């Protein structure tokens, strides 16, 4: 989900772009500004919300010990989904 | 005689690189002319033996 | 459990001494 400033410089996933009058753009002259174009905030929004039949769900991020520490997410709010604080996968109680 | 087997292994290296042209190709690009089993080729043309 | 271990009978004997094999003719024979 990369975009471009009016200077022609790409904006990173942080939101960093130099100003037009900033001299430090001269480091990219004849070279390139290395950005990663796989924005993690856009890719985790592409994941579907997991409908589970429990009140409390556990997430370890997949892979068992290859994921993150296993946390427990409450799903009592029906207004909001329950988001994992590590991996950003989100859960909803189906009732 | 086992020197004849050495010379035949050299000649079959020449034959196994597809003739003298491919032999000299791998000689000047690789500094190495020994033949191997082609394990694979990636999407770039790098061949793995 | 599965762990890096020696085999059941252990490993074979490993040489560790000097082996300078004493080759050549005698000093009488070399003159």
């Amino acid at each position: 989900g990369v975009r471009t400033s009016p200077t022609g410089e790409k904006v990173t996933h942080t939101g960093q772009v130099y100003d037009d009058e900033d001299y430090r753009r001269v480091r990219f002259v004849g070279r390139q500004k290395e950005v990663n174009e796989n924005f993690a905030i856009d890719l985790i929004a592409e994941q579907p919300v997991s409908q589970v039949g429990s009140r409390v769900i556990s997430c370890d991020g997949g892979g068992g010990a290859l994921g993150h520490p296993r946390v427990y997410i409450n799903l009592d709010k029906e207004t909001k989904t329950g988001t994992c604080g590590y991996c950003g996968l989100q859960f909803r109680q189906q009732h | 005689m086992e020197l004849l087997q050495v010379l035949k292994r050299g000649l079959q290296q020449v034959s196994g690189h597809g003739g003298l042209r491919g032999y000299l190709r791998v000689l000047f690009r690789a500094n190495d002319v020994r033949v191997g089993t082609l394990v694979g080729e990636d999407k770039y043309g790098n061949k793995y033996y | 459990v599965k762990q890096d271990m020696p085999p059941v009978g252990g490993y074979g004997p490993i040489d560790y001494k000097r082996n300078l094999p004493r080759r050549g003719l005698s000093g009488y024979s070399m003159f």
Binding site: E21, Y23, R24, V26, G30 | - | -
Partner: protein, 297 residues
């Protein structure tokens, strides 16, 4: 004034001086010590280079990481000049040749390229422009060097009206072609009077001209403290160097007297004490060794 160009630090290598300099001709004799004195303050120095990048290697230890940006440029390419100057707040011109080549005569090096750099720096919004003429630049001069350098001074002044133009007399240093020319000539003695100026004095004058807002639109004449005749100067060079490539234009310039311009400001008006030759001639001419000082006028 943008926040990234506010000065910070104590003026050392990792500091921020707030100077973003594009130094054309930085791979030469003056550019060496100018990029040295800029990089030790913590300036952003853009070095456009024409030569092999190997020949720019000595410019790389002169500043902190990312403080010298090297980029290709061509003197007849305004796109490369604009590519080099559009982020800078000062552009220094040090482009020069003592001889004319097959591709570049004195009009290309001293008129066309300085007017191109000054015009492109004017239309890129560069605040400060420093141009280096010669003290003996005259339209009616006998040498093609000084004629084209006077014409280029006039064109730089008329296309960048706030340019600081600097007149050095004859710059001596370790990599000069003034004392090293006399020490390797082993042409004669005439009635020519010279006051040669030291290279660190010239560099301090250029950097004080960057920092002084009163130096905009001025014409400075950087001269040494002592005027010498040419004959006893050359004899002093052969005396210090322990001794018993040229062209006729260089001979016309060695036999051209360094004019006195009291109406122009000098090194003292930029806060620079002009170092005499006798303190620094040993430092130059120690290389030529396999002394009573010269008489001033």
């Amino acid at each position: 004034l943008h926040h990234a160009v506010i000065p910070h630090g104590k003026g050392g290598r990792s500091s921020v001086s707030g100077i973003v300099a594009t130094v054309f001709g930085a791979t030469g004799f003056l550019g060496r010590y100018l990029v040295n004195h800029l990089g030790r303050m913590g300036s952003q120095v853009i070095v456009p280079y024409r030569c092999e990048p190997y020949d720019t290697m000595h410019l790389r230890p002169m500043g902190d990481l990312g403080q010298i940006i090297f980029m290709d440029w061509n003197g007849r390419d305004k796109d490369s000049i604009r590519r080099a100057v559009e982020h800078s707040n000062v552009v220094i011109n040090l482009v020069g040749r003592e001889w004319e080549t097959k591709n570049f005569d004195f009009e290309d090096v001293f008129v066309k390229i300085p007017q191109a750099i000054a015009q492109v720096s004017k239309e890129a919004g560069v605040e400060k422009f420093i141009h280096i003429s010669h003290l003996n630049a005259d339209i009616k001069s006998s040498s093609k060097y000084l004629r084209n350098k006077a014409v280029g001074e006039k064109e730089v002044r008329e296309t960048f009206p706030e340019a600081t133009i600097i007149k050095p007399a004859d710059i001596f240093g370790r990599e000069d072609r003034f004392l090293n020319y006399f020490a390797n000539i082993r042409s004669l003695g005439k009635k020519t009077v010279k006051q040669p100026v030291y290279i660190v004095d010239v560099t301090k004058g250029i950097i004080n001209a960057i920092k002084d807002p009163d130096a905009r639109g001025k014409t400075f004449a950087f001269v040494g403290p002592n005027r010498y005749l040419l004959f006893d100067l050359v004899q002093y060079v052969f005396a210090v160097a322990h001794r018993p490539w040229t062209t006729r234009d260089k001979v016309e310039r060695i036999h051209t007297t360094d004019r006195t311009l009291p109406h122009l400001p000098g090194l003292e008006d930029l806060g620079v004490q002009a170092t005499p030759l006798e303190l620094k001639a040993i430092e130059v001419l120690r290389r030529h060794r396999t002394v009573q000082p010269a008489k001033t006028v």
